[PDB]
């Protein structure tokens with residue numbers, strides 16, 4: 001698709017068999033989702049946003065569909081204000097910025 | 100141009116007679132820059148991101164140039180860790196997400 005930016009670029013993702021809404025965020029290195037359960041072991045990460053830092057749980061090699069496009073990669077889980085899809089997954093689904 | 104997302108999408112902006120580097124951020128409602136002077140009226144605003152909120156000054160009808168594309172819009176100024184170009188200006192230079 002081609003997504004214009006007059007509204008928030010909110011898309012449906014699927015992760016762990018569940019649908020969620022998330023924001024396609026080219027300003028984010030990483031993908032960070034609201035509290036949820038994921039399988040396997042997690043590692044610590046501290047990520048910084050415009051308001052400061054939060055601690056998150058890092059899960060690797062997680063399957064996630066984004067607008068129907070299949071990706072498998074790192075998903076952080078923590079107290080984010082919204083679900084954000086960052087460049088780590090945007091690159092997997094072939095996203096670019098164009099003007 | 101077509102801008103890849105392997106790296107952070109940083110560009111040069113011209114604003115208030117100054118050249119600055121900033122991040123093209125499809126996930127950001129607003130454009131927010133580190134402390135700088137701008138002409139004209141302003142009013143305070145709280146904006147939120149990962150980590151919570153910061154207080155910024157809101158300047159309206161500010162001319163900006165982004166990759167040689169001229170636009171005008173609201174620019175927020177305050178203690179953001181990094182300069183962000185948000186959707187309010189990305190629309191004006193015809194920026195889209197494509198995959």
Ligand SMILES: COC(=O)N[C@H](C(=O)NN(CCC[C@@]1(O)Cc2ccc(cc2)C/C=C\CNC(=O)[C@H](C(C)C)NC1=O)Cc1ccc(-c2cccnc2)cc1)C(C)(C)C
Pocket residue numbers: 023025027028029030031032047048049050052081082084086124125126127128129131146147148149180181183185
């Ligand atoms: C490499 O770090 C990151 O990639 N951080 C990212 C990040 O915060 N990146 N930002 C871009 C802004 C992200 C976000 O779009 C993320 C976001 C957050 C909330 C919402 C949408 C999108 C919805 C709620 C309110 C609307 N808020 C916003 O639209 C704000 C804008 C006002 C700025 N939008 C955002 O904050 C830019 C950013 C980059 C680095 C830092 C940073 C650097 C050094 C020390 N501390 C922080 C801070 C901000 C993460 C999402 C992974 C935390």
Ligand SMILES: [Cl-]
Pocket residue numbers: 072073074088089
């Ligand atoms: Cl990844």
Ligand SMILES: [Cl-]
Pocket residue numbers: 171172173187188
């Ligand atoms: Cl505006």
Ligand SMILES: [Cl-]
Pocket residue numbers: 004193
């Ligand atoms: Cl348009």
